[PDB]
Design an enzyme around this catalytic site. Structure first.
Site, PDB file in Angstrom:
ATOM      1  N   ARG C  52     -29.674   0.990  52.155  1.00 12.18           N
ATOM      2  CA  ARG C  52     -29.056   2.227  51.697  1.00 12.18           C
ATOM      3  C   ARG C  52     -27.561   2.041  51.494  1.00 12.18           C
ATOM      4  O   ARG C  52     -27.000   2.502  50.494  1.00 12.18           O
ATOM      5  CB  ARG C  52     -29.322   3.341  52.705  1.00 12.18           C
ATOM      6  CG  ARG C  52     -29.196   4.735  52.140  1.00 12.18           C
ATOM      7  CD  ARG C  52     -30.382   5.084  51.260  1.00 12.18           C
ATOM      8  NE  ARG C  52     -30.413   6.508  50.953  1.00 12.18           N
ATOM      9  CZ  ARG C  52     -30.862   7.441  51.781  1.00 12.18           C
ATOM     10  NH1 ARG C  52     -31.345   7.136  52.974  1.00 12.18           N
ATOM     11  NH2 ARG C  52     -30.819   8.715  51.404  1.00 12.18           N
TER      12      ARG C  52
ATOM     13  N   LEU D  42     -30.521  16.726  49.864  1.00 10.80           N
ATOM     14  CA  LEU D  42     -30.910  15.327  49.866  1.00 10.80           C
ATOM     15  C   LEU D  42     -30.373  14.631  48.624  1.00 10.80           C
ATOM     16  O   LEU D  42     -30.237  15.240  47.559  1.00 10.80           O
ATOM     17  CB  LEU D  42     -32.432  15.180  49.921  1.00 10.80           C
ATOM     18  CG  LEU D  42     -33.146  15.780  51.131  1.00 10.80           C
ATOM     19  CD1 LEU D  42     -34.615  15.410  51.100  1.00 10.80           C
ATOM     20  CD2 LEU D  42     -32.507  15.320  52.430  1.00 10.80           C
ATOM     21  N   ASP D  43     -30.066  13.345  48.769  1.00 11.64           N
ATOM     22  CA  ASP D  43     -29.577  12.547  47.658  1.00 11.64           C
ATOM     23  C   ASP D  43     -30.755  11.974  46.874  1.00 11.64           C
ATOM     24  O   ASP D  43     -31.922  12.172  47.217  1.00 11.64           O
ATOM     25  CB  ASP D  43     -28.653  11.436  48.160  1.00 11.64           C
ATOM     26  CG  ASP D  43     -29.410  10.295  48.809  1.00 11.64           C
ATOM     27  OD1 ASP D  43     -30.530  10.527  49.309  1.00 11.64           O
ATOM     28  OD2 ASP D  43     -28.881   9.164  48.821  1.00 11.64           O
ATOM     29  N   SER D  44     -30.442  11.242  45.805  1.00 12.79           N
ATOM     30  CA  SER D  44     -31.491  10.756  44.916  1.00 12.79           C
ATOM     31  C   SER D  44     -32.455   9.832  45.644  1.00 12.79           C
ATOM     32  O   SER D  44     -33.674   9.925  45.462  1.00 12.79           O
ATOM     33  CB  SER D  44     -30.870  10.036  43.722  1.00 12.79           C
ATOM     34  OG  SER D  44     -30.266  10.948  42.825  1.00 12.79           O
ATOM     35  N   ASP D  46     -33.325   9.741  48.716  1.00 13.43           N
ATOM     36  CA  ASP D  46     -34.213  10.417  49.656  1.00 13.43           C
ATOM     37  C   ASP D  46     -35.520  10.813  48.987  1.00 13.43           C
ATOM     38  O   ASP D  46     -36.599  10.652  49.570  1.00 13.43           O
ATOM     39  CB  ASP D  46     -33.521  11.645  50.245  1.00 13.43           C
ATOM     40  CG  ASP D  46     -32.541  11.290  51.339  1.00 13.43           C
ATOM     41  OD1 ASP D  46     -32.771  10.286  52.042  1.00 13.43           O
ATOM     42  OD2 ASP D  46     -31.538  12.015  51.498  1.00 13.43           O
TER      43      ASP D  46
END
Ligand SMILES: CCCCCCCCCCCCCCCCCC(=O)OC[C@H](COP(=O)([O-])OCC[N+](C)(C)C)OC(=O)CCCCCCCCCCCCCCCCC
Ligand SMILES: CCCCCCCCCCCCCCCCCC(=O)OC[C@H](COP(=O)(O)OCCN)OC(=O)CCCCCCCCCCCCCCCCC
Ligand SMILES: CCCCCCCCCCCCCCCCCC(=O)OC[C@H](COP(=O)(O)OCCN)OC(=O)CCCCCCCCCCCCCCCCC
Ligand SMILES: CCCCCCCCCCCC(=O)OC[C@H](COP(=O)(O)OCC[N+](C)(C)C)OC(=O)CCCCCCCCCCC
Ligand SMILES: Nc1nc2c(ncn2[C@H]2C[C@H](O)[C@@H](COP(=O)(O)OP(=O)(O)OP(=O)(O)O)O2)c(=O)[nH]1
Ligand SMILES: [Mg+2]
Lengths: 40, 98, 116, 88, 115, 320
Positions: C52, D42-44, D46
Site C-alpha cells: 500500500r 475509503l480510497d480507490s 480499498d
C-alpha cells in the site's frame, strides 16, 4: 386417441444416480458419459 | 505342534489384521501383504525341512518368486494412483459407487 | 507536433490506471505465499501494508507513459518474488530493519549535523 | 443436499459478512446502500481489496472492468445475482 | 555361536564409533548452520521431488531379472543329475526366456532415458 | 481385406504410408470472408484433396446415392429460417447448431481416415475445433438459452478429446464492416438480415479463445484480406513450416491403430451426439421419431444394408 408413450418427466426418473433418492445419496452425481473424470 | 508353530502362526494373524484394517496409506497395506508371504514362507520351509520332504524343498522358492512378482504389479498400481491424485491415500479411491 | 509522443502500453490515464489495479491484485494475492516460501518473520498484515505504501507514493503522477514504466518495473519486481530469484535478504530490503531513524524536526537535524 | 439455491436475501448476508470483517469500515454505518467512497471515506485501493475479498467467499472471477461499477454493497449483490442467475 | 559372535562385533564396533563421533566434538548450532545445503541459494518451491517414471521401471526391471536369477542359482548342483538331456533343456530355457525379456524392453523403448 | 487388427498385423501400418507432406490443413474465417476460394487452392497446389464445408446435408452426401434427402430426415433444421426468426420459440436455433456440429464431427473422422488410409493430406473449412464461435455468438444475442450451451459443451468434451488437432491452421481476417459489404453484393435475401453485433461475436470468439489456444498446439498462419488473395505465398509458407509442436510428434503405429479403428466406424464417432439429456430443443417425441424412421426405410436403397437392396438393382442377394 393415440396410445400413451412415456414423456420427459417419466423418463427422467431413470436418469439419476439411484432409483430411490434419500438423505444419504443426495450428493451423488451420474458418472461421465465416457468414464473419464477430468484430470486435476 | 511346537512353540515355534504358535509364534509363526501368530505372525500371520497379526499381518492379516493389519491388511484388513487400512489406516490411510496404500503403501502401508502392501507391506502387510508381503508380511503375510514371509510367514507362509517360514511355515512351509519349517515343515518341509523338518520332515525330509526333499522334492518339496523347491516350493518355498516358487512361493517367493510369484509373490514377489505380484508385489511388483501392486507397486505399479500404487504409482499410477500417485500420478492421478498427488498421493497414495485410499480415500481418494472413492469415485466408483460414490 | 512535438507534444505528440509514442505510447508504451496505454493511450490515456483511464487505460493506464487499469494496469495499476491489475498489478495491485497480483501483489495482494502473492504476499501470503511470499512470506511462506521465504520464511520471513513479518505478518501478512504488515506485508500488505508495505505494498500500500509503495503505490501511495506514486499517486501524484499524471503522465500515462510514466505510469506504464512504473507498472512494467512493478511486474518485474513480482516475477522475481514468484520464481524465488530473490533471496530472503532482497525481500526484506523494503522494510529497512537496520537503519536508525533520521528525524525530520528542525532541532534534531540542527543538533546532529549541517544537512537540511 | 445442504446446498440450497442462492437467494438475494441470502447473498446480501454473505456480502455484508465480509464487509463486517474489515478493520477500515465501521460496522455501525455499514448500511446496505452506503457508497464505499462517498461516505465511508475509503480510497480507490480499498474497493479493490473488497472485491478481492468478495471473490473468496463467492468463488468466481470478477473482471476489473466490472469492478469499476461495483461501488455499493447493493450493486455487489446485484452483480452476483446478475451472474449466478438468482432472481426470486 | 561363532557366526553370531562375529556379526555382533562388526556391528558393535561400527556403533561404538558413531556414539564417540556425535559426542566427542564440540557443537554450536544456529539456524543457518542446520539448514539443508541446497546450493547456497534459498530454495525454489516447497514441494518434494516429483515422481520420475524411468527410475521406477529400472527398479521393477531389476526385480524381475533378479527373480529369474534365483531359479538359475542352483545350476551348479543341477548338473550332477543323471538326466542331463532334460537339465540342459530347462537351463537354456530359463536363460533364453531371460533374453526375450531384455529384447522386449529394448524394442519397446524401455531401456531409453530420452523422454 | 477390410482394415482391422489382422490387417495391422499383416502390415498395413500408418507410418509406412504417410510422407512428409501428409498434413491436415484447416482454413478458418468469418462469414463471406472468401475462405472457400482460398481453401480450394491450398489443396490444389499441394496435391491434397478438398472437403467442402459441412452443410446440413453433408451426411447424405457420403451415404446412399449421395444426393440431399428431404428436409424431414434432418430435424427440420433449415439455415434460412435461422436468420429470419433467430429467436423462434420452436427451438430451431440451437437445433441447427447441434446438427451442424455432428456433421462436422463426422466430416473430421472422414478426413483423419483419408490421411491415415492413403497418406494424402486434406484441407477443411471450419472444423469441430472452431465450430464453437457460432454457438457462443448466438448465446450472447439471446438466440439460445444457457442450458443449450451446457448441452453443447458436454457433447464436445466427450467427443473432441478422442481426436488430433489440425497440423496447420490458416486463419483469414476480414473486418466486420467489410464483411457486411460482401454480404450485400452476393444477393442472398436471407443472409442480409445478419445483425452486425452478431458478426462481431464471431470475431471476438475467433481471436479471443480460438487462436490463442490453438497456437500452442498447431501451426498458425494469420493472413489479411489482401494477402490471402494470392495462393503461391500461402503454399510456400505452408511448405516451409518447421512443425516443431503438436500431438502428432508423439504418435506411433500403435496409437494410430486405435485412431483408425474409431474413424472407420461412424456409429462410434456419433455415439455421444445423442446422449440422453432431455433438452426441449433437441428432444423428439416417441410418435414423431417412430413416424419419421418409418418413412426413411421406404426410400430407395435404405431399407436394408448397403448391397442387399433389390430395388436399386443389386444382384447375388441370395449369396452375398
Ligand atoms: C547403543 C545404542 C545405539 C545408540 C546410537 C546413538 C548414536 O550413536 O548417536 C548419538 C545421537 C546423538 O545425537 P545428535 O548427534 O543427532 O545431536 C545431539 C548432539 N549431542 C549428543 C551432542 C547432544 O543420539 C543420542 O544422543 C543417543 C544417546 C547415546 C549416548 C550414549 C553415550 C554413552 C555410550 C556408552
Ligand atoms: C487369537 C490370537 C491373537 C490374535 C491377535 C490378532 C490381533 C493382534 C493385533 C494386531 C495389530 C493390528 C494393527 C491395528 C490395525 C490398524 O492399524 O487399525 C487402524 C484403524 C484405522 O486407523 P486410522 O486411519 O488412524 O483411523 C482411526 C482414527 N481414530 O484404527 C482404528 O480405528 C481402530 C484401532 C484398533 C487397533 C486394535 C485392533 C486389535 C485387533 C482386533 C481383532 C482381534 C482378532
Ligand atoms: C520367437 C518370438 C519372438 C521373440 C523375440 C521378440 C523380440 C521383441 C520384438 C518386439 O518387441 O517388437 C514388437 C513386435 C513387432 O511389432 P511392431 O508393430 O513392429 O512394434 C510395435 C511396438 N509398439 O511386436 C510383438 O510384440 C511381437 C512379440 C510378442 C511376444 C513377445 C514375448 C514372447 C512371446
Ligand atoms: C472374428 C474374430 O474373432 O477374429 C479375430 C480377429 C479378426 O481380425 P479382423 O481383421 O477383424 O478379421 C475379421 C475380418 N476379416 C475376416 C474380413 C479379415 O483376428 C485377430 O485379431 C488376429 C487373429 C490371431 C492371429 C494373431
Ligand atoms: N449459426 C451457425 N451458422 C453457420 C455455421 N456454419 C455456417 N453457418 C452459416 C454462416 C453463414 O451465414 C453461412 C455460410 O457461411 P460461410 O462460411 O460459408 O460464408 P460464405 O459462404 O458466404 O463465403 P465463403 O465460404 O468464405 O467463400 O452459414 C454454424 O456452425 N453455426
Ligand atoms: Mg461459404
Amino acid at each position: 386417441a393415440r396410445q400413451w408413450q412415456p414423456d420427459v418427466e417419466w423418463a427422467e426418473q431413470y436418469g439419476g444416480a439411484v432409483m430411490y433418492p434419500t438423505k444419504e445419496t443426495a450428493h451423488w452425481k451420474p458418472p461421465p458419459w465416457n468414464d473419464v473424470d477430468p484430470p486435476k | 505342534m511346537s512353540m515355534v508353530y504358535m509364534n509363526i502362526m501368530m505372525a500371520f494373524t497379526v499381518s492379516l489384521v493389519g491388511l484388513l484394517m487400512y489406516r490411510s496409506h496404500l503403501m502401508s497395506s502392501l507391506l502387510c501383504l508381503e508380511g503375510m508371504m514371509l510367514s507362509l514362507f517360514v511355515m512351509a520351509a519349517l515343515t518341509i525341512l523338518n520332515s525330509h520332504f526333499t522334492l518339496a524343498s523347491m516350493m518355498p522358492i516358487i512361493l517367493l518368486v510369484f509373490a514377489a512378482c505380484e508385489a511388483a504389479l501392486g507397486l505399479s498400481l500404487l504409482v499410477m494412483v500417485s500420478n492421478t491424485y498427488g498421493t497414495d491415500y485410499v480415500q481418494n479411491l472413492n469415485l466408483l459407487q460414490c | 507536433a512535438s507534444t505528440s509522443v509514442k505510447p508504451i502500453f496505454s493511450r490515456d490515464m483511464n487505460e493506464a490506471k487499469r494496469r495499476v489495479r491489475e498489478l495491485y491484485r497480483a501483489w495482494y494475492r502473492e504476499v501470503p505465499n511470499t512470506v511462506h516460501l521465504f520464511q520471513l518473520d513479518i505478518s501478512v498484515k504488515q506485508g500488505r501494508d508495505k505494498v500500500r505504501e509503495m503505490f501511495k507514493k506514486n499517486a501524484h503522477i499524471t503522465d500515462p507513459r510514466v505510469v506504464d514504466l512504473l507498472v512494467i518495473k512493478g511486474k518485474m519486481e513480482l516475477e522475481e518474488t514468484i520464481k524465488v530469484w530473490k533471496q530472503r535478504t532482497h525481500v526484506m530490503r523494503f522494510f529497512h530493519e537496520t537503519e536508525a531513524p533520521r528525524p525530520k524536526d528542525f532541532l534534531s537535524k540542527f543538533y546532529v549535523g549541517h544537512d537540511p | 443436499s445442504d446446498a440450497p439455491p442462492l437467494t438475494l436475501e441470502g447473498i446480501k448476508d454473505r456480502v455484508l459478512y465480509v464487509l463486517k470483517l474489515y478493520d477500515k469500515i465501521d460496522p455501525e454505518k455499514l448500511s446496505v446502500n452506503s457508497h464505499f467512497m462517498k461516505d465511508l471515506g475509503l480510497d480507490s485501493l480499498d474497493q479493490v481489496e473488497i472485491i478481492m475479498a468478495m471473490e473468496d467467499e463467492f468463488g468466481f472471477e470478477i473482471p476489473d472492468i466490472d469492478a469499476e461499477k461495483l461501488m455499493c454493497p447493493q450493486e455487489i449483490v446485484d452483480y452476483i445475482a446478475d451472474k449466478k442467475d438468482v432472481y426470486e | 555361536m561363532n557366526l553370531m559372535l562375529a556379526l555382533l562385533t562388526n556391528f558393535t564396533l561400527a556403533t561404538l564409533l558413531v556414539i564417540i563421533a556425535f559426542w566427542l566434538p564440540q557443537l554450536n548450532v544456529y539456524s543457518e548452520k542446520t539448514s539443508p545445503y541446497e546450493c547456497g541459494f534459498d530454495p525454489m518451491g516447497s514441494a518434494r521431488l516429483p515422481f520420475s517414471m524411468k527410475f521406477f521401471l529400472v527398479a521393477i526391471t531389476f526385480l524381475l531379472f533378479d527373480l529369474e536369477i534365483a531359479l538359475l542359482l542352483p545350476l551348479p548342483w543341477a548338473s550332477q543329475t543323471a538326466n542331463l538331456n532334460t537339465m540342459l533343456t530347462m537351463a537354456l530355457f530359463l536363460i533364453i526366456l531371460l533374453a526375450v525379456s531384455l529384447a522386449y524392453e529394448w524394442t519397446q523403448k524401455g531401456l531409453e532415458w530420452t523422454e | 481385406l477390410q482394415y482391422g487388427p489382422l490387417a495391422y498385423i499383416l502390415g498395413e501400418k500408418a507410418t509406412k504410408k504417410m510422407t512428409e507432406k501428409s498434413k491436415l490443413i484447416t482454413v478458418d474465417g468469418n462469414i463471406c470472408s472468401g475462405k472457400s476460394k482460398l481453401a480450394k487452392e491450398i489443396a490444389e497446389k499441394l496435391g491434397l484433396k478438398h472437403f467442402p464445408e459441412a452443410g446440413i446435408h453433408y451426411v447424405d452426401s457420403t451415404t446412399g446415392d449421395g444426393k440431399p434427402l428431404p428436409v424431414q430426415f434432418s430435424g427440420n433444421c433449415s439455415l434460412e429460417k435461422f436468420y429470419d426468426d433467430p429467436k423462434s420459440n420452436d427451438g430451431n436455433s440451437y437445433r441447427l447448431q447441434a446438427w451442424l456440429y455432428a456433421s462436422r464431427l463426422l466430416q473430421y473422422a472422414d478426413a483423419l481416415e483419408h490421411l491415415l488410409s492413403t497418406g494424402q493430406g486434406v484441407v477443411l473449412e471450419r472444423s469441430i475445433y472452431s465450430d464453437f464461435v457460432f454457438l457462443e455468438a448466438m448465446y450472447r444475442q439471446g438466440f439460445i438459452r444457457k442450458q443449450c450451451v451446457d448441452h453443447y459443451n458436454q457433447v464436445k468434451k466427450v467427443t473432441i478429446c478422442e481426436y488430433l488437432p489440425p497440423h496447420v491452421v490458416v486463419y483469414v481476417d476480414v473486418p466486420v464492416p467489410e464483411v457486411q459489404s460482401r454480404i450485400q453484393k452476393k444477393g442472398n435475401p436471407h443472409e442480409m438480415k445478419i445483425t452486425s453485433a452478431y458478426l462481431q461475436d464471431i470475431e471476438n470468439a475467433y481471436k479471443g479463445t480460438f487462436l490463442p489456444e490453438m497456437s500452442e498446439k498447431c501451426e498458425v498462419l494469420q493472413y489479411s484480406a489482401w494477402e490471402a488473395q494470392d495462393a503461391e505465398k500461402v503454399v510456400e509458407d505452408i511448405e516451409y513450416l518447421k512443425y516443431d509442436k503438436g500431438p502428432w510428434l508423439d504418435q506411433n503405429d500403435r496409437k494410430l491403430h486405435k485412431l483408425r479403428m474409431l474413424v472407420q466406424d461412424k456409429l462410434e464417432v456419433l455415439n455421444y451426439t445423442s446422449i440422453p439429456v432431455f433438452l426441449p430443443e433437441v428432444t423428439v417425441g416417441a410418435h414423431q421419431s417412430d413416424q419419421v424412421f418409418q418413412e426413411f426405410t421406404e426410400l430407395p436403397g435404405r431399407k436394408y444394408r448397403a448391397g442387399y437392396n433389390e430395388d436399386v438393382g443389386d444382384k447375388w442377394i441370395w449369396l452375398k
